[PDB]
Design a binder for this molecule. Structure first.
Ligand SMILES: *[C@@H]1O[C@H](CO)[C@@H](O)[C@H](O)[C@H]1NC(C)=O
Ligand SMILES: *[C@H]1O[C@H](CO)[C@@H](O)[C@H](O)[C@H]1NC(C)=O
Length: 532
């Protein structure tokens, strides 16, 4: 039977799903680790013990315990990102979509969800793998990993809550794919890992970590890179935040053993309810529990690993959206709201820059302000609003990604860079947010090909072209068809630095993506903050 597969962990039974008037098979909710519950909370994951009988893989698994966005009750713009399943600490599962008939040895793509390392689910509607598996004939996998304190509480030195366990969860799912994807018809020597935001930063983290590099072949990073300012903290900061969490739950703080024991007695929601209270500054685009530079998963600092070429050398394809910062200002900066144009006064502008660069002293804040203020028209509320949107996106996503890309390309085997700037015609968020963080995902997973979703014909075309670049790059290391007549996406080089736009108009090639602002964020500001 096509829906029954025998793997090294036991037999699983799938289910047949319709997609674009045809069908494929789906194996949903396959377990790859023991449930990380009770005494296992905060611990490295254990491999799932093989089972007898047939594992029913016909429905979605639970989503991991996480904070839930209630900022706009009933609004589908925010709700489509919340868990659409019951939450549970028993949540380590993966999902596989496989063409029909079952391939023998085809290209594999493994998706790693974003969500600031504090939230996220593999089961969201926008992450449905069936359009991509079907349209490009690839075996599509999506994994899951613990987030929040459950996945990243870090008391370096203890083996009970070492930190990075959420990254070890992703690594285990990658190990399981390496070991069993052949039975579903996938080629384990041709797997591409791809992810967005924290998912994109995770991808870059597996390219860096010696223990993860042998498990995949190529990588795709969307709006995220390993060195982003919000993606990691030192062991000292990790520890300080773990103790502060403990202090919020009135825990005994005399020892790691006593702190960890107290935290393990708490119900999930108790930790989620005070999680935000441990950030060290009033800030936006900062999350409490994230990867920690421990000397194990990351042998040395990320910067020196990048300088010396200490990382997997392969091809990578990555990029950004035009208005990455708008989501974070909407949610936490004074003067912005969902239903107005959000024109910003000089004073809210000033409040906004303080919140966006929380680690800067006064001279630092002054440099940023000067760099983004048009002094011939300083009270223009639209310029102040967009100015703030660019500060958040440049500092948190684009410039860190450009620094990663310039360091990688020096040692890698091929880089392709894109700049996604098409605003979907059916977006429910207001116009001022532009091309929002996260909205290139629906085009990557092919949602524009389903008519009932209301996209235009050129949007369906944009989506087919993106799906075909991603899958062709996964199969071959190059997004371009060998003899196509279509326009070429050129290779990004240390010398020329070319990249392309991704939108409904004819591809245009450009150079030095946001180079003026990124020399400010990557070279000047850090030198100004170290000297003062
Ligand atoms: C990739 O590596 C192969 C052999 O290791 C080499 O022939 C080719 O020039 C490389 N491509 C790039 C863009 O570095
Ligand atoms: C497992 O799949 C769904 C889960 O609710 C349901 O039809 C039934 O419980 C199971 N089906 C089979 C074939 O075991």
């Amino acid at each position: 039977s096509e829906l029954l597969v025998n793997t090294k962990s036991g037999k699983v039974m799938g289910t047949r799903v319709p997609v674009l008037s045809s069908h494929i098979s789906a194996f949903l909710g396959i377990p790859f680790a023991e449930p990380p519950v009770g005494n296992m909370r905060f611990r490295r994951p254990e491999p799932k013990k093989p089972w007898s009988g047939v594992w029913n893989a016909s429905t979605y698994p639970n989503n991991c315990q996480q904070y839930v966005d209630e900022q706009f009750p009933g609004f589908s713009g925010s709700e489509m990102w919340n868990p659409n399943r019951e939450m549970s600490e028993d949540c380590l599962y993966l999902n596989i979509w496989v063409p029909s008939p079952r391939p023998k040895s085809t290209t594999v793509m493994v998706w790693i969800y974003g969500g600031g390392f504090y939230s996220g689910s593999s089961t969201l509607d926008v992450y449905n793998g069936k359009y991509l598996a079907y349209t490009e004939e690839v075996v599509l996998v999506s994994l899951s990993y613990r987030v929040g304190a459950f996945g990243f509480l870090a008391l370096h030195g203890s083996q009970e809550a070492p930190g990075n366990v959420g990254l070890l969860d992703q690594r285990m799912a990658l190990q399981w794919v390496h070991d069993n994807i052949q039975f579903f018809g996938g080629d384990p020597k041709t797997v591409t890992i791809f992810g967005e935001s924290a998912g994109g930063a995770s991808v870059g983290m597996h390219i860096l970590s010696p223990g993860s590099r042998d498990l995949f072949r190529r990588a795709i990073l969307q709006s995220g890179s390993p060195n982003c300012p919000w993606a990691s903290v030192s062991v000292a900061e990790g520890r300080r935040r773990a103790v502060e969490l403990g202090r919020n739950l009135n825990c005994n703080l005399n020892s790691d053993e006593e702190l960890i024991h107290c935290l393990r007695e708490k119900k999930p929601q108790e930790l989620i309810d005070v999680e935000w209270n441990v950030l060290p500054f009033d800030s936006i685009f900062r999350f409490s529990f994230v990867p920690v530079i421990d000397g194990e998963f990351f042998p040395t600092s990320l910067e020196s690993m990048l300088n010396s070429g200490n990382f997997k050398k392969t091809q990578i394809l990555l990029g950004v959206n035009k208005d990455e910062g708008s989501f974070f200002l909407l949610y936490g900066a004074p003067g912005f709201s969902k239903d107005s144009e959000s024109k910003i006064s000089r004073e809210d502008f000033m409040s906004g820059v303080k919140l966006s660069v929380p680690h800067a002293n006064d001279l630092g804040l002054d440099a940023v302000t000067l760099q983004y203020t048009d002094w011939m028209d300083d009270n223009n509320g639209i310029k102040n609003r967009d100015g703030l949107d660019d500060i958040v996106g440049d500092h948190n996503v684009i410039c860190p990604l450009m620094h990663f890309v310039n360091k990688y390309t020096k040692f890698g085997n091929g880089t392709y860079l894109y700049f996604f700037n098409h605003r979907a015609s059916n977006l429910v968020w207001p116009e001022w947010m532009g091309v929002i963080h996260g909205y290139e995902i629906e085009f990557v997973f092919g949602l524009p090909l389903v008519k009932e979703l209301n996209y235009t014909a050129e949007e369906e075309a944009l989506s087919r072209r993106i799906m075909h670049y991603w899958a062709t790059f996964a199969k071959t290391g190059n997004p371009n068809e060998p003899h196509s007549q279509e326009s070429k996406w050129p290779l990004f080089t240390t010398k020329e630095q070319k990249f392309i736009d991704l939108n409904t108009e004819p591809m245009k090639v450009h150079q030095r993506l946001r180079v003026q602002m990124c020399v400010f964020w990557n070279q000047f500001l850090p030198k100004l903050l170290n000297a003062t």
